[model samples]
Target: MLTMKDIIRDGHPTLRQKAAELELPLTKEEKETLIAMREFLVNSQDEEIAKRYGLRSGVGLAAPQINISKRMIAVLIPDDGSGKSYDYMLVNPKIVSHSVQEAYLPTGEGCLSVDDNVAGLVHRHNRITIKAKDIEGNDIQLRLKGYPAIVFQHEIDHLNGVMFYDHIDKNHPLQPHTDAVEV
Candidate 1:
């Protein structure tokens, strides 16, 4: 069980530093931390649990967010189009490939590590092929598009010390994003 306090805020130095890569067959201690990260996302989405714990709703979380500079991220998109849910507990996830065309969320993106709501559409690839290891240390490739792609990209940025707002074009933050399609 992780609370908002467990998550580091924007001014934290780790949020700006590049996270280190993790080794294969992750250490037992690392496994425990990753499990907690995954559970935090799940618990935050549960109505009763979230209310009781005061957990902010979140779709993804990264290791650096918890002040651990490792390339691990958890993404759980409740509805990945159709009725199926998308659950990913990934380690060292990397975008091996991506789309030239881009996509955006009309409402914009939010982060558990960030408290204030920053308005601006963050540009992301409409589709991406991510190469990474699963929680069990099994290798996997995730080809994602639409909303799922957006969530994955957001989490991956944390590994590189890149915030969602970093993608926002300064001069054309809100308006010029019309060049991309809405997700």
Candidate 2:
């Protein structure tokens, strides 16, 4: 099980460096890492598991956050009241296309690696199409919308060494954009 202690903080070198792409036919250790990443995301959302393990709830995680420096991510979009949830373990994901419509979380966004509230609307595409590989190295294309779309972008940004706050205007962190929808 992964803990908060395992997550590298904002200033860590791994968080700033572009992660290396994963090759086809992952190694044994790499396969185990993917499994752990998915399990951590899933367990972090469970009340009992989180309490027992002192885990922080998060929708997604990147390998770099754990100092792995691999272009891999695990995401778990919680049930959206409609009993719909999305879970994925993406390897070397890249956003192929996105909507012009921008969106942001109304209350702002938080990150596992960032401890302080940065107080900003991290605008993201409302919909996105991604090209990536599954844990089994099979190619997969994902079309995501709304919250799932945001989570995908966030995780993919990690692969390119970008943080959520990087998208915010430092001079006006909470500046509102008329074109951006509050999701």
Candidate 3:
């Protein structure tokens, strides 16, 4: 199991470097790391477990944040009352297509690696199609929209050495790009 202590904070070199892609059929250690990342998200969202272990609530995590510098991410989006949940552990994920219209959350976005609440409207694609491999090396594709799309984009950004704050406009942080809609 991975603890909060295992998660590296911002400014770490690994977080800024493009992570390497893993070979198919992950080794034991690689498989374990991805599993642990998924478990961390589950534990972090559990009130008792998060409180007991001091785990910050998280929707997603990338391998680079753990200093592995590998192209892997774990996302666990809780049910949104619509009876839909997005949970995945992806490797070498790539966005195959996306909607031109931008979208953002009303409450803004938070990152597991960032402790500070860097307030800004982080607009991303309203919808996206991605392709990747699961832990067992099976290929998969996902079409995500709204919050789930935002979560996947956020996690994929980490693999490419891009932080959520980097997408925020510096001059007009709160202003959304033209035609950007709230998701």
Candidate 4:
């Protein structure tokens, strides 16, 4: 019975802080937060919000983006690879490896905290392999490509007090990258 009240948003300082690493064996509280976050995304009216942001996308959410700042991520990558329908994904994820190759895509992006504002041309990894835990205490590994890959990288950035703006091109500087960072 997780609720939106459990999820935090941008501007709440926690969203901007570097997230602590998740302990190997999750505690009861950590497991609870993971379930709560999955519930939030599955129930979110993100379609309407996506409209406000101008790009239609994604099937997951992360703790850091919601200001929770833990190593939790939830995704709904469709089992058939067609995104028409999906079940909830609870990825208590960790990055096991990274590739030398990276990619940039210009998707309209917004933060739940920023609301209605948009950013463009975020550079992110096109492929990723992550080792994570599910809410049921099972270990799972995810190899994501395309949009799912983008989501994975985005959430991991939040864990490090990083934001999509950090990867934006200087010529297009949609927002200042260093404004909220601590020196």
Candidate 5:
């Protein structure tokens, strides 16, 4: 099992730096790190997995979110509105293409480093194609549309130093969420 550091609140320099390319030939330590990250993400927020590895809650955790500074993010975006299923593990994920559909969802969002202060109208596309790796380090392609796609792209942008507030369109009317949901 591998341990991860919590993300900095104001955002760390690493979260901004453009991640380096994933070298074809990975080192033993790199492979090990990837495995650890995968395991952690798979079991994140699951109490049983936490007992198995003695970890705490983690819904969607990123490499940089853990202070690893790698271009990787794990999400449990629900495909159906039921919210019972997890889409897939997104490793070294990057957005390759996107649609013109846009939306502003007013949700209280927070970073591991940034506490309760997180609040904003996050803007995103309705669909997107993301290129990423799997747990085995094999390249996998994904075309995500609707809410899942938006959330995925939003998180990826964080790995590259972009924030939700950065997308706030001052020209457009902003509506705050009347109810709160924990993500």
Candidate 6:
């Protein structure tokens, strides 16, 4: 089981380098890694587990955040309207299509790898169609919106060595996007 100790922090070389693409028919170890990643996300959200292990609540995590350097990510997003949650374990995921309208989190975005608070607006697509594979290596496509869309984009940025804060304007971190909706 992975805990907060397994996560690599900012300034780590792996976090800056572009993660390598995972090959098809992933090996057993790779599959296990994905399972561990998913478990970490799930466990981190559990109140008792999180407090016991000193883990921060997170909706998503990238393989690079754990020093794996592979093109994979896991997400567990809770729906505000439905009171339900969605979990995703995507391998070699890419945004195939997206909406023109942009959206952002009101408070700001946070990362497991980033310890300090970064005040900024990280604009993301309001809707996105993603092409990727499941942990079983079967091809899958996903259409996501709102919070899930933002989480997907954030994790994808990790695969390309881009941090959410990088999208913020250095001079104006909290630049308001009046045209964009807040999630």
For each candidate, the alpha-carbon lDDT, in order, equals 0.89, 0.90, 0.92, 0.61, 0.62, 0.91
RMSD of each: 1.3, 1.2, 0.9, 7.0, 4.8, 1.2
Once fitted onto the true fold, the runs of candidate 5 whose alpha carbons sit more than 4 angstroms away are 1-5, 47-58, 78-84, 170-173, 176-183
Q: How do the residues 1-183 of candidate 6 rate in per-residue lDDT, one tens digit apiece?
A: 998888999999999899999998899999999999999988998999999999999999999999988999998887767876778899999999999999899898999899999898998999999999999989889998888899999999999999999988777778767678889
In lDDT terms, how accurate is model 1? 0.89
Backbone clashes in model 1, listed as residue pairs: none
Q: Between 2 and 6, whose lDDT is larger?
A: 6
lDDT score of residue 8 within candidate 3: 92
lDDT of model 4 at residue 74? 70
Task: Show model 3 residue runs off by greater than 4 Å.
Answer: none
Instruction: Enumerate residue pairs that collide in model 6.
Output: none
Say which prediction, candidate 4 or candidate 5, comes out ahead on TM-score: 5
Top candidate, metric lDDT: 3
lDDT winner between 3 and 5, please give it: 3
Q: Which has the higher TM-score value, candidate number 2 or candidate number 3?
A: 3
Error of 3 at 166 (Å): 0.3
Query: How does model 6 score by TM-score?
Result: 0.96
Candidate 3, residues 31-95: lDDT per residue as tens digits? 99999999999999999999999999999999999899999999999888999988899999999
Residue-by-residue lDDT tens digits, candidate 5, 87-166: 46556787888777564444534455454554456657767888988756788898876556666776787677776566
lDDT (tens digit, per residue) of candidate 1 on 1-183 = 678879999999999899998888899989989999999999999999999988998889999999999999888778746797888889999999999989988888888778898977788999999999997789999898888899999999999999998887777567645466788
Looking at candidate 2, what is the lDDT of residue 28?
Answer: 92
- Candidate numbers, best lDDT first, in rank order: 3, 6, 2, 1, 5, 4
Decoy 4 TM-score against native? 0.70
Can you tell me which runs of candidate 2 are displaced by over 4 Å?
A: none
lDDT (Cα, 0-100) at 174 in candidate 3: 81
Per-residue error (Å), model 2, residue 83 = 3.2
What candidate 4 gets wrong by more than 4 Å, as runs, is: 1-7, 45-58, 65-67, 78-92, 173-183
Instruction: Choose the strongest candidate by TM-score.
Output: 3
After best superposition, candidate 3 residue 74: deviation in angstroms? 0.6
